[PDB]
Design a protein around this ligand. Structure first.
Ligand code: HEM
Ligand code: HEM
Ligand code: A1BTW
Ligand code: A1BTW
Ligand code: H4B
Ligand code: H4B
Ligand code: CA
Ligand code: CA
Ligand code: CL
Ligand code: CL
Ligand code: GD
Ligand code: ZN
Lengths: 401, 401
């Protein structure tokens, strides 16, 4: 009943006893596995009680007098108002745990180091924009990136929601044509046409930084431009292919995801943007080489004078590696924090070891932990994993439109 | 029915075929175990009936008098004897269906092209060896590789099974060095020590072809030496790195898995070796660069004058790509069939499309279908997959010792 977990490189065996505490059900059944799919009152009280019990257990104040007082407080608040309020310390712990619980995050070695900005007093999109700019400023830190989350007011009944319509704080526009294709990032064609309708006059470049569509409850969203000095970017060059710089490729320093819902003790924060730093394959492999993203692989291979008319020359593999080399080199030259996929998967193995001792396992999504190049060259390829949902959690949520 | 999305193209299918899954997998709504490597006459009759229905469906004669008579014939034989015999045509169809149903096989575009050798009248380990040698001869075909399976007698009560103890017909010895290390292939250390145990004089090279341990019913295994002219091998060289040839690397032409159980209509064939041809990442990435296999990555990188002290030079990725290049170049030079991971995954995408039309789905294990290098450079990375167990099937089975 406790799954056996084997590492095939070393032969080590562990047992995931944590999977028993999985609060929610995932998409798989004994009949069929859907692990590869991207998108798989008294009720509030039971989740709220569960989280408080987690928190006090985690500070060794379990069952003490402060534990019961907080339990009765949430009872009264929910009866009085329909909801309740986290103490600032509970919010901090709950955000760290939602990161710690994210099965698809290879960066969780860092989970204990997260700057939490409490923006639960926010109202209006103008204040929203100020909190976000402070977050971006703090997290970018002149290239020495620091992990941070900003928590905007929770959802509650009768009232609208706070939403960041952009999937990330920094996104490059994507524009379609009468020739059908996209110039810029195809991933952002939708948010680009939304920003246009809500005021923004569009650029025409391959890396036009999008504005922010920030939404206060019930109010339509307001359009905000980001101070260019706030948005650190890294122009991409290669250490030995001197023509690589002339492709005009660039990427931004700060990955800051703004469209996920943070859930803590049954509360729901539809706007809680978090940022850390990049793993280099996210940029060099997925963002630049995916067929449905910038799709630059063949351009680079033509410049490397590779034989592209036969798959078996491995021209795709060679071009991809050099693009990832360029990313690592360009970020290091610019003194912007970045981690290559070998270092990051090595640290995730350590995190698996630490979590086994900390709580008897660790939820992990193999398909997302294994890097998209050089999979089996990294230790996580050889590591069996168990995926399950724990709360607090980061969850997907529907688009505000 | 599970909705299945391709994220490159945006296309969407529903896997209705999964609803027919017979046997249960390892996953539950509470936890996904999809990344784990190793997860009475009445049941026989329902399995036989289903298989007979499958056969008559395949030849577009469902509900025909021949269909009904054959069901009654199977029913009568099971009632009288507790088991039954396949018709030859059913054996051929069942072996092809078992390949078609194998979720971890990326080469299933070929599933209709399989030479089925019927060895169900085999009576001794010596006759086994003759049947195996003819298989290797046929399938190797002096490098123009042809897919084939040889089906030895089914399991039946009151008699031991036929078994091939070796995991493949052609395997390199793995000599347990006394330093706790291994000379040769570490995957084959167990079968190597059983070969010596049974009287084989061992070599000391890194690419010593193992002898076969063949088991006739109720008989200890017997040792048989493969004729050297029957075992086609490919010396490994690199098209532009001339020193690569001096590594002394080799691999064999013919991948012929011999330790899986073939299951058709509830009958079980514990010895049914099958062979096709290699996808190059199997040799170049896993067999040569896995840390727990030949583990040549660092040595090749040093010969390439790469900086092996920092991960961020991507020296592992660069050496791995050249080793895969050497494998593809060397097999092409030797005129031995091989497919690269780009072509194989593209053909697997056509197979998924064929199977969606033909059967409404296709069982597929994403973790095994995505190649171990350049995963997201291949189209299967972006394809959601549904994993489930259909029959006929190739199954893992316990080792005979
Ligand atoms: C600090 C260094 C970090 C690194 C190197 C890192 C790395 C990654 C990577 C490579 C992914 C896969 C993303 C994709 O493929 O689209 C991911 C996913 C994720 N990360 Fe981390 N991350 C870091 C920090 C954080 C932080 C601070 C949080 C939240 C507080 C976080 C929460 C998540 C979540 C929830 C996902 C899942 C997203 C999804 O399911 O789509 N990560 N991370
Ligand atoms: C025709 C060329 C073929 C190619 C290129 C191919 C490719 C592959 C590859 C690359 C794997 C993964 C192996 C590993 O990583 O250990 C695999 C697995 C598998 N193949 Fe194919 N294959 C071919 C033909 C066949 C044939 C003829 C059969 C049987 C009649 C077959 C049945 C299977 C099965 C059952 C597995 C699963 C093995 C396991 O779970 O350990 N394949 N195939
Ligand atoms: N290091 C980081 N990375 C990272 C972590 C979590 C989430 C993300 C962003 N995840 C993108 C998921 C995604 C990718 C492509 C497409 C897409 C859609 C249409 C066409 C083509 C592609 C859609 C989605 C969302 N479904 C990045 C960090 C971000 N914050 C702190 S650390
Ligand atoms: N193209 C082909 N390929 C292929 C298909 C199916 C199975 C295989 C062999 N799969 C080996 C799985 C494996 C890998 C490593 C280790 C191991 C064990 C201990 C130490 C180190 C490694 C053990 C196993 C088997 N459990 C190859 C073909 C084979 N027939 C026709 S086509
Ligand atoms: C279909 C498949 O689940 C999809 O391509 C996944 C696979 N693994 C991934 N892994 C990461 N880290 N990020 C991703 O977006 C994906 N995409
Ligand atoms: C732990 C993990 O399941 C294991 O390393 C798997 C992953 N995917 C694989 N894929 C293939 N084709 N072959 C393998 O042996 C494996 N091994
Ligand atoms: Ca037009
Ligand atoms: Ca008969
Ligand atoms: Cl990104
Ligand atoms: Cl192999
Ligand atoms: Gd040369
Ligand atoms: Zn599953």
């Amino acid at each position: 009943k406790f799954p056996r977990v084997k590492n095939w490189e070393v032969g080590s065996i562990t047992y995931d006893t944590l999977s028993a505490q999985a609060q929610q059900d995932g998409p798989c059944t004994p009949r069929r596995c859907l692990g590869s799919l991207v998108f798989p009152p008294e009720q509030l009280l039971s989740q709220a009680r569960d989280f408080i019990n987690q928190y006090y257990s985690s500070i060794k104040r379990s069952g003490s007098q402060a534990h019961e007082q907080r339990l009765q407080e949430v009872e009264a608040e929910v009866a009085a108002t329909g909801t309740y309020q986290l103490r600032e310390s509970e919010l901090v712990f709950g955000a760290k745990q939602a990161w710690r619980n994210a099965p698809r995050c290879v960066g969780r070695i860092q989970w204990g180091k997260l700057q939490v900005f409490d923006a639960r007093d926010c109202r209006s999109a103008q204040e929203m924009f100020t909190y976000i700019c402070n977050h971006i400023k703090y997290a970018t830190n002149r290239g020495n990136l620091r992990s941070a989350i900003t928590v905007f007011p929770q959802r509650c009944p009768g009232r609208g929601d706070f939403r960041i319509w952009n999937s990330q704080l920094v996104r490059y526009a994507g524009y379609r044509q009468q020739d059908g294709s996209v110039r810029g990032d195809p991933a952002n064609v939708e948010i680009t046409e939304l920003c246009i309708q809500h005021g923004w006059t569009p650029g025409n470049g391959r890396f036009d930084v999008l504005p922010l569509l920030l939404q206060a409850p019930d109010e339509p969203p307001e359009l905000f431009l980001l101070p260019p000095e706030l948005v650190l970017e890294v122009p991409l060059e290669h250490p030995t292919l001197e023509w690589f710089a002339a492709l005009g490729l660039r990427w931004y320093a700060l990955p800051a995801v703004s469209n996920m819902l943070l859930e803590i003790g049954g509360l729901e924060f539809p706007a809680a943007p978090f940022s850390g730093w990049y793993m280099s394959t996210e940029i060099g492999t997925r963002n630049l080489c995916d067929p449905h993203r910038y799709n630059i692989l063949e351009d680079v291979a033509v410049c490397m004078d590779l034989d592209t008319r036969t798959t078996s020359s491995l021209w795709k593999d060679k071009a991809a590696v050099e693009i990832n080399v360029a990313v690592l080199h360009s970020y290091q030259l610019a003194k912007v924090t970045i981690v290559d996929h070998h270092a990051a998967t090595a640290s995730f193995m350590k995190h698996l070891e630490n979590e086994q001792k900390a709580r008897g396992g660790c939820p992990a999504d193999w398909a997302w932990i294994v890097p998209p190049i050089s999979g089996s060259l990294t230790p996580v390829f050889h590591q069996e994993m168990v995926n399950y949902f724990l709360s607090p959690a980061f969850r997907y949520q529907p688009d505000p439109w």
